[PDB]
């Protein structure tokens, strides 16, 4: 019954530090090394170093050498990790990891935490710039849409008609961008005859910036 | 002959062998001290990484 | 990342998968972990065959020389993952184990230019919807109008649809001085090996 429970979601500024929790719990927490794993989303698992809960000496890796500090708490049996100087690619989720009982070894992690995610600021609270995706001439049934570009942060609730048009809506999911904003795209299918008298409006809501916005898709010319 | 100087501070309340629950006061000791000990051995440890 | 893992591997429902694990040098004991998305990694086989309590005996590990390698038969809907191999500090890249069909199926790509009220401004943003594909696997590649564009480009990882199908979008920055220079463009989604291409013009009315 070996719980590992880490700290809640942390944002920081790039240069200013984290320091992240992870209190363990059903086993003797002085007699095991703790480990810290990160992985960056999308990639894959990376080892950032292990503490000695007894003594307290540490083994951070070589590329983390002089910016990671691990401390430990034997009285609550919480074990530490902080981050000084964050830099763009340090957003990861954040597991500390433990040896297997048996084989008198390390280097068997079957005890994980759940994780902690860091963020990189870069971007703050902005505005979304919603541009229509005018239909081309399916027959028929042509496609249209709206394009929500340039918002920060997460997330924007996109419907069409406002609520009345549900089919066929396909909003898809947001892709991040280098300066933190984020942007997505929302396309419904209609029929092309219904083009001139009926009215096709994308209701695009961004609650971290109190923006509420609706663009009409008009047929492009010709 | 140019030799190396190490910085000591001195505790009297230690807590050695991991033992939590029982400290000692080492009494002091009263004159001035001085051994001369043959270092004979290392306890080293690798950092490791993705080197 | 000196062990090497291939970046993806297929199977179908029932038959077995292997998961080779390639390592320069290094000459003992070797250790594979399978996470899904959201949740931390799971060790499966530790010490190359030994297998902790309580996972399936369908997991099973092997090494010979410098190649270790997992086998896993009779793959289920959840046994898809990814799978790390680990020795000693390092891991490998990963490999994301696929146990889809796949249904018939080629990706729907609906591709839309910069509004007019977007020109207005000095931006340009290139809308490349990919719908109901299957499986989740999509390179998507941009030319101007024919030569390879990667730079300014936003590519949507898979994800999954309610038909239980996958779904992506890609995007491409560009300035309305080069929005209005060349003559064509191209999103080119590249699917279980054939492209699916959408034409672009900048010759509005
Ligand atoms: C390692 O070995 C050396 C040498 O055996 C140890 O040095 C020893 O140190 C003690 C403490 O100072 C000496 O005892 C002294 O005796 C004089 C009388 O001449 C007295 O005035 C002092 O108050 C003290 O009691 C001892 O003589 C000396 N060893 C020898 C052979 O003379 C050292 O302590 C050992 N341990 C370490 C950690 O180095």
């Known amino acids: 019954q070996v719980q590992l429970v880490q700290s809640g979601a942390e944002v920081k500024k790039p240069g200013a530090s984290v320091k992240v929790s992870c209190k363990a719990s059903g086993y003797t927490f002085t007699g095991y090394y703790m480990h810290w794993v990160r992985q960056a989303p999308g990639q894959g698992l990376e080892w950032m170093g292990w503490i000695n809960p007894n003594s307290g000496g540490t083994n951070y890796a070589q590329k983390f050498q002089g910016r990671v500090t691990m401390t430990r708490d034997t009285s609550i049996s919480t074990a530490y990790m902080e981050l000084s100087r964050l830099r763009s690619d340090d957003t ?4 500390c990891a433990r040896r297997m009982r048996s084989q008198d070894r390390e280097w068997d992690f079957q005890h994980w935490g759940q994780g902690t995610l860091v963020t990189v600021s870069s971007a703050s609270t902005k505005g979304p710039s919603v541009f229509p995706l005018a239909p081309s001439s399916s027959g028929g049934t042509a496609a249209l849409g709206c394009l929500v570009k340039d918002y920060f942060p997460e997330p924007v609730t996109v419907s069409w008609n406002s609520g009345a048009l549900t089919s066929g809506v396909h ?5 991040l961008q280098s300066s ?3 942007s997505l795209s929302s396309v419904v299918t209609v029929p092309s005859s219904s083009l001139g008298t009926q009215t096709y409006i994308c209701n695009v809501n961004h609650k971290p910036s109190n923006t509420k916005v609706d663009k009409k898709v008009e047929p492009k010319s010709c | 002959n140019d030799s190396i100087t190490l910085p000591c501070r001195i505790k009297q309340i230690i807590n050695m062998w991991q033992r939590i629950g029982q400290a000692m006061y080492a009494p002091p000791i009263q004159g001035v001290i001085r051994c001369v000990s043959n270092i004979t051995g290392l306890i080293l440890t690798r950092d490791g990484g993705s080197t | 990342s000196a062990l090497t893992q291939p970046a993806s591997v297929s199977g ?3 038959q077995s998968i292997t998961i080779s694990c390639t390592g320069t040098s290094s000459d003992n004991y070797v250790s594979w972990y399978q996470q899904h998305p959201g949740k931390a990694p799971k060790l499966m ?6 297998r902790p309590s309580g996972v399936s005996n369908r997991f099973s590990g092997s090494k010979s020389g410098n190649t270790a390698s997992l086998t896993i038969s009779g793959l289920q809907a959840e046994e898809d993952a990814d799978y790390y191999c680990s020795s000693y500090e390092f891991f490998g890249g990963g490999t994301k184990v696929f146990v889809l069909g796949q249904p018939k199926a080629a990706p729907s790509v609906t591709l839309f230019p910069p509004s007019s009220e ?3 401004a000095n931006k340009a943003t290139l809308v490349c919807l990919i719908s109901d594909f299957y499986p989740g696997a999509v390179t998507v590649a941009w030319k101007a109008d024919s030569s390879p564009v990667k730079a300014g480009v936003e590519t949507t990882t898979p994800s999954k649809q309610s038909n239980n199908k996958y779904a992506a979008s890609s995007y491409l920055s560009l300035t309305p001085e080069q929005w209005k220079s060349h003559k064509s463009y191209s999103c080119q989604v590249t ?3 054939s492209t699916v291409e959408k034409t672009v013009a ?3 009315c």
Do not use: K
């Not at chain 1, 990861?92 to 597991?95: E, G, I, P, Q, R």
């Not at chain 3, 086989?45 to 030994?50: A, K």
């Open chain 3, 202 to 204: 900048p010759t509005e």
């Open chain 3, 118 to 120: 977007e020109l207005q």
């Open chain 3, 45 to 50: 086989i530790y010490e190359v065959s030994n």
């Open chain 1, 180 to 182: 933190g904003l984020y």
């Open chain 3, 191 to 193: 699917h279980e090996g």
């Open chain 1, 171 to 175: 909003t898809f999911p947001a892709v």
């Open chain 1, 92 to 95: 990861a989720v954040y597991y």
């Open chain 3, 12 to 14: 179908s429902p029932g």
